[PDB]
Design a protein around this nucleic acid. Structure first.
Ligand SMILES: Nc1ncnc2c1ncn2[C@@H]1O[C@H](COP(=O)(O)OP(=O)(O)OP(=O)(O)O)[C@@H](O)[C@H]1O
Ligand SMILES: [Mg+2]
Lengths: 983, 202, 198
RNA sequence: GAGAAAAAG
DNA sequence: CACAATTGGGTTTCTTTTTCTCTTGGCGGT
DNA sequence: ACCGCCAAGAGAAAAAGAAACCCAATTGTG
């Protein structure tokens, strides 16, 4: 029942505060009445017994156990652990504790099993062990088994003890990293962070000063008013808890009063002119209260100091001055050398969260008062509330909102307020991240972080991780920890140039927007009125779009300005496939050209003997002019454009401008500047290079299809077989479409003139690449039209010639050169179709050990067939991509290489790219050497055919699923000689 | 003019001098509410009905008149009938199903409630601009009506006198309608009071 | 049956009715024909002018129309109301959507008497597009005028009374360029409705 | 919650 | 009770992140 | 300088678009 859930939440969360005598009163009140005695026994009695056990009160547990005996339900082993805990922390009676042990040995409970099954507090567990040792030293279980190691064939070389292995070492000393850890601890305890804006502070005038003065004075006023209202309302609820139930006093005093007045003032500041819904502010306020509780519990519990000590012991592994006694993995040194304790608090249920949000919003309304109007005269001598809740219309449903008073909006607009408030999670780290010990363990220091990203609910994604074998998830967690330990900094000169273009109007073609001033901001005929309405609508939408781009640009470049001359570590999380995403959203390498160009490595390898050439290749790889030619011609092209490189690096914006026109202009500028700095040196090899170097994939999903069942045709078309000249399927398909279009133009169709040879690789990449997946022609026409929407040549589009040639006409030729891969596609589609008809969701295991499930359910909930037969291949082939990426990551880490990887685009320093390449080919050969298709067939049979629902669904699925397409006469071992696999 | 700004139907003042029975209802897309208050201070009834089968994606007229008849079965009979027209316009592309819902209910209910329309030849149901009936009060800012929950709480517990026969039930239901965001019944008493002030008892 | 009639009624009540009317309204005016279901039909007239379309949509002009149409209204045992499938998802054609729905609602309110007194929902809405298949008049996307088929009927499925047939033939010959009498096709679809009434 | 868009696979 | 073969209506390979407003705009003569 | 106010019609503008496609429902059947 819901009321039982709310009562359990109350009695659980009152332990996390110190209001135990307040907890006893409501328990006694509910036990006093027989109608209130129901739904009271459900797991709250051991909670309050543990509550009296943690405090220095051993006498009350006799009354607690008498109450449990009055309830008549059997005592829990947690209650026996609480009894052993209250025997602890106090002078032992030297008697009847063994009688209590005999009593708990009766009725089936075991003394040995409570250390492993109760999952009590570990300090209380040590106290219980101390009490037992005071009773008898006979029993002492050792939990320190040797650390379990994965036994998979692919991961065997990573975890092998033997062999010469070298690990990367960070540049900074140990003490500097400890000071950085201190700074991030202070930055995380206060969850908000204030960022100076990159908006120009323009024209401080007398009206501005008047607005600032009255705003500061009224701000002190409403801070005092909010504190007074919190005191009065908390006193009212403390009076209510004496004569009632569910009263919110422990929920409101969970935090201190200063943090909630700052939280309410911040949520008052964040409201736009049009206030959002009451439900939205309730959700935001209570979720922020929950995150605040998780942050601020560990100060008073004492885990922050223990985390600091364990971090001090662990940080010697990544420190330059200190030496670990034997080299080992970043996670395994955390697994040994002590272990921290994670509470893993379950969040309180939905009605408690919603209702606490409701009272916080109502408190903010009834407290916060603005005097009269904005004008200097004060003749009315009355104070009106600033925010009124308003019955409004929203978009489809009538939902009450919270609208601020317009004079407050006018005053808020009058003051500039250069401060920006960012969350603690969104801003990057200041210390190296917490290692991924377990899916429950997180990369952040004081805040939780889930392993796999979900939209809403979706518990089965983490349930498969929970039920996964303990050593199977070890490799993925190590790879995520590796991705966390990357050291970053922002460029000085690129940031300066981007900000200089930001302050002025700038150029919008680079990704830096303009201020809205440069944005557009008697009737003769009704047609003239219609034209005027149309151009007002166009002006309004364009102004809204430009303001929308400008706001995100300001919010990114402000954080970039804040994060100059410091070192940073981006933690990484997982999607449900296995593909990794950076947890800080605003500033990461999965961003734009500008955002990618700002980042460089904090630690710089020397260029080595090979060196500068590779950097130049990377420049051409982002220049975009030459993609279909070999590496020697790319180096020759980089040699020919050297004068433009020197001119662009010496004078980026004032002088001759070459880094325009490239597909990624600012990254081209960054590589340009790093190359020009590298050349101007006495020794090119001894120079320190901080620039990341890119390695991208040619057509990766088609390669992965070609491996799952080898081919001689198609596999050689995706550069798996070695070749001197790279072979791209997209250019061949584009050429075939163009030579059909030439004949259609000779025939005389009107659409052939409006295509006009504007077809390229980028036009058809999405559609030809989704041909190998299950594609509907609507999906083809939504991607072949968007590309021609960004091109500005021909105005009026009907794109069905390209789709009707691309999935119908060249689809004969697509069947001609892609034979066997479509058999794999039909096999997977039919398997998923019969699984959907059986009623299950498809689960598959990656070769590394990550289990993947699909969150496609109909509106307990039936699977949706349409988004499950389709979207099964581009949900498994990406899992194979991620398994290959993590294998490349681990074998890159073993050779002393620093490795950060965009998915299907790896990054490494200039010297280290050849070793990372050989790692990549070795992992590709290793991953597909194990037969993925037959193991997948066996797992699909074991999961989706082991129950006899009916004879037809068993028989047809067995007959279709036992068949695997036959691989061809092509050797996977050639990939080690493949030069243009990932280049 | 001014009374024409308030009232959309045109009723001359002599009948409005003594009406002796007024019912005020407020349409809502999820829930319905009504209250009877005379030209004198007396409040007769206050009820709301919930759990419509409607706005479920299918628009059908039969269940429309089934729901309107189920509402009218509890309604009493009075001299003039108060309606609250929305502030929405047909030109607004957004909120169109809500506007169609409001227009269809106002048509169905204005079509009913008048058994003797062909006999008297005079209109009986009158509607209100919500902005103007707020404008008798002070509740607007930026041409938008606020809740009036605090105002109706101050008026309930003079601007309006609630009879003591049902005031206990009014308070008991008011605690629930104050815990939840139920704004429809709160505007009914306010628009009734402004009807009895601005066009009546001048 | 269920596809042809969105509401449902007893089959014996559907088959045997003393007299019905054709409640079918256009954009400009409404026309009602008195069908006695014995294939002998009594009276057909139409509204002279609609005053509600002038100005804005407001309840007063709607009521002033509906009192006049229901005042000219003859008593019938059963009543058939048309049902148009104007899609709500279409962003255009909003004013005619409100026009047709509100006119349908107030026809379904004023004409349908004794709903509170007698539990039978009395007037039912007819699927026009499914009846268009029984017409076999076009492909189905659009419906042509039924003036040709009633002209083929008279001037014998109509069977006007002898005193009424000459005056109705004279009135039909007098009115041929109004271009709003397309509802004449609906005046025989009730005859098509008698295919359900047998 | 829906919309106007934008950038990565 | 137990089916049941044919006939329309929501959806169109997949996965991340981000910003903003929920028609207001125009007219008015004090 | 500031609320006041206000009426937002009925115009053809038909704008994208259709083209598969599959998965569940319904009067008929034993
Ligand atoms: N819209 C998409 N839908 C499905 N998969 C996608 C999509 N975009 C990218 N991918 C996946 O990304 C991978 C390859 O895409 P990507 O854009 O990186 O091409 P590429 O191999 O780098 O091509 P190129 O080097 O020729 O530009 C594949 O695994 C493919 O499935
Ligand atoms: Mg790639």
């Amino acid at each position: 029942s819901g009321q039982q859930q709310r009562l359990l939440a109350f009695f659980k969360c009152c332990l996390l505060t110190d209001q135990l005598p307040l907890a006893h009163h409501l328990l006694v009140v509910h036990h006093g009445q027989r109608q209130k005695r129901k739904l009271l026994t459900l797991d709250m009695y051991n909670a309050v017994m543990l509550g009296w056990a943690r405090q220095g009160a051993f006498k009350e547990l006799v009354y607690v156990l008498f109450m449990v005996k009055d309830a008549g339900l059997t005592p829990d082993l947690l209650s026996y652990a609480a009894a052993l805990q209250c025997m602890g922390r106090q002078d032992q009676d030297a008697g009847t504790i063994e009688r209590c042990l005999e009593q708990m040995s009766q009725e089936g409970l075991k003394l040995q099993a409570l250390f492993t099954a109760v999952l009590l507090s570990e300090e209380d567990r040590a106290t219980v062990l101390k009490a037992v040792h005071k009773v008898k030293p006979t029993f002492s279980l050792p939990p320190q088994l040797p650390p379990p190691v994965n036994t998979s064939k692919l991961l065997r070389d990573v975890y092998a003890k033997d062999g010469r292995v070298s690990y990367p070492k960070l540049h900074l000393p140990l003490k500097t990293l400890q000071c950085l850890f201190e700074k991030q601890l202070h930055m995380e305890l206060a969850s908000r962070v204030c960022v100076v804006s990159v908006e120009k502070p323009t024209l401080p005038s007398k009206e501005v000063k008047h607005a600032r003065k009255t705003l500061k004075t009224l701000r002190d006023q409403w801070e005092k008013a909010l504190c007074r209202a919190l005191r009065e309302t908390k006193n009212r609820l403390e009076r209510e808890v004496y004569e009632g139930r569910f009263s919110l006093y422990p929920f409101l005093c969970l935090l201190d009063e200063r943090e909630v007045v700052r939280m309410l003032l911040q949520v008052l500041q964040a409201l736009p002119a049009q206030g959002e819904s009451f439900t939205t502010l309730a959700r935001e306020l209570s979720a922020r209260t929950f995150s605040r509780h998780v942050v601020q519990r560990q100060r008073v519990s004492g885990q922050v100091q223990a985390l600091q000590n364990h971090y001090r012991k662990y940080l010697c592994l990544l420190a330059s001055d200190a030496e670990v006694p034997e080299p080992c993995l970043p996670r395994q040194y955390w697994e040994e050398l002590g272990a921290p304790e994670a509470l893993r608090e379950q969040p309180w249920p939905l009605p408690v969260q919603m209702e606490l949000g409701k009272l916080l919003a109502e408190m903010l309304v009834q407290a916060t008062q603005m005097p009269c109007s904005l004008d200097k005269p004060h003749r009315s001598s009355r104070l009106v509330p600033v925010l009124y809740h308003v019955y409004s219309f929203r978009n489809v449903q009538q939902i009450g909102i919270l609208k601020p008073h317009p004079a407050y909006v006018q005053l808020l607009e009058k003051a500039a307020e250069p401060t920006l408030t960012f969350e603690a999670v969104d801003v990057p780290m200041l210390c190296p991240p917490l290692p991924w010990t377990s899916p429950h363990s997180g990369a952040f220091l004081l805040s939780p972080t889930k392993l796999m990203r979900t939209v809403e609910g979706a518990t089965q994604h983490q349930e498969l991780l929970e039920t996964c074998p303990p050593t199977a998830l070890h490799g993925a967690l190590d790879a995520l920890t590796q991705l966390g330990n990357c050291a970053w900094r922002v460029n000085g000169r690129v940031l300066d140039l981007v900000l200089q273009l930001f302050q002025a109007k700038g150029c919008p073609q680079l990704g830096v927007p303009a201020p809205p001033s440069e944005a557009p901001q008697h009737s003769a005929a009704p047609a003239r009125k219609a034209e005027l309405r149309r151009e007002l609508a166009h002006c309004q939408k364009v102004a809204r779009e430009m303001h929308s781009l400008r706001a995100e640009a300001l919010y990114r470049l402000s954080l970039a300005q804040h994060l100059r001359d410091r070192v940073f570590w981006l933690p990484h999380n997982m999607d449900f496939r296995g593909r990794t995403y950076p947890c800080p959203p605003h500033f990461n390498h999965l961003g734009s050209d500008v955002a990618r160009a700002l980042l460089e490595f904090a630690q710089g390898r020397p260029l080595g003997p090979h060196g500068l050439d590779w950097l130049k290749i990377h420049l051409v790889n982002l220049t975009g002019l030459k993609k279909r030619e070999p590496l020697r011609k790319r180096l020759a092209f980089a040699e020919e454009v050297m004068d433009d490189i020197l001119d662009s690096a010496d004078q980026p914006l004032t002088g001759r401008k070459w880094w325009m026109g490239a597909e990624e202009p600012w990254q081209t500028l960054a590589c340009c500047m790093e190359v020009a700095n590298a050349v101007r040196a006495s020794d090119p090899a001894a120079y320190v290079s901080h620039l990341p170097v890119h390695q991208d994939g040619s057509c990766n999903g088609l390669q992965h299809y070609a491996a799952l069942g080898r081919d001689s045709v198609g596999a050689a078309s995706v550069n798996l077989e070695p070749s001197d000249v790279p072979q791209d399927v997209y250019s061949g398909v584009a050429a075939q479409v163009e030579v059909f279009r030439r004949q259609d133009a000779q025939r005389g169709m009107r659409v052939a003139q409006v295509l006009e040879g504007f077809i390229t690789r980028k036009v058809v990449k999405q559609t030809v690449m989704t041909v190998v997946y299950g594609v509907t022609r609507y999906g083809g026409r939504l991607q072949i039209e968007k590309r021609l929407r960004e091109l500005s040549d021909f105005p009026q589009e009907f794109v069905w010639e390209a789709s009707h040639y691309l999935v119908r006409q060249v689809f004969k030729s697509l069947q001609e050169m892609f034979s066997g891969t479509r058999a794999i596609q039909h096999w997977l589609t039919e398997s998923a179709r019969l699984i959907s008809h059986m009623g299950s969701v498809v689960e598959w295991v990656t070769p590394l050990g990550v289990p993947v499930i699909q969150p496609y359910r109909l509106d307990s909930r039936k699977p949706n067939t349409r988004k499950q037969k389709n979207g099964f291949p581009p949900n498994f082939i990406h899992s194979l991509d991620s398994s290959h990426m993590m294998l490349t990551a681990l074998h890159c880490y073993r050779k002393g290489l620093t490795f950060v990887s965009v998915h299907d685009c790896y990054w490494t320093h200039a010297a280290d790219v050849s070793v990372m390449n050989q790692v990549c080919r070795e992992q590709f050969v290793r991953l597909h050497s194990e037969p993925i298709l037959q193991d997948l067939s066996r797992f699909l049979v074991k999961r989706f055919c082991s129950e006899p629902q009916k004879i037809l669904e068993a028989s047809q699925l067995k007959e279709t699923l036992q068949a695997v397409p036959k691989p061809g006469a092509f050797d996977l071992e050639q990939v080690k000689r493949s030069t243009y696999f990932f280049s | 003019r001014f009374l024409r700004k308030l009232l959309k139907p045109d009723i001359e003042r002599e009948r409005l001098k003594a009406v002796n029975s007024i019912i005020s209802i407020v349409f809502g897309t999820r829930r319905i509410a009504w209250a009877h208050l005379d030209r004198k201070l007396t409040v007769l009834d206050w009820q709301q009905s919930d759990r419509w089968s409607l706005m479920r994606g299918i628009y059908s007229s039969s269940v429309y008149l089934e729901e309107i008849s189920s509402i009218i079965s509890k309604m009493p009979k009075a001299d003039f009938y108060v309606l609250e027209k929305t502030g929405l316009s047909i030109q607004n592309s957004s909120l169109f199903p809500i506007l169609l819902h409001f227009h269809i209910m106002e048509a169905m209910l204005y079509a009913l409630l008048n058994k003797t329309f062909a006999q008297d030849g005079q209109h009986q149901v009158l509607s209100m601009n919500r902005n103007a009936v707020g404008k008798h009060f002070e509740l607007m800012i930026g041409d938008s009506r606020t809740s009036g929950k605090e105002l109706v709480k101050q008026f309930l517990f003079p601007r309006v006198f609630f009879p003591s026969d049902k005031i206990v039930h009014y308070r008991q239901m008011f605690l629930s309608t104050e815990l939840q965001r139920v704004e429809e019944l709160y505007d009914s008493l306010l628009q009734a009071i402004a009807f009895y002030e601005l066009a009546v008892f001048d």
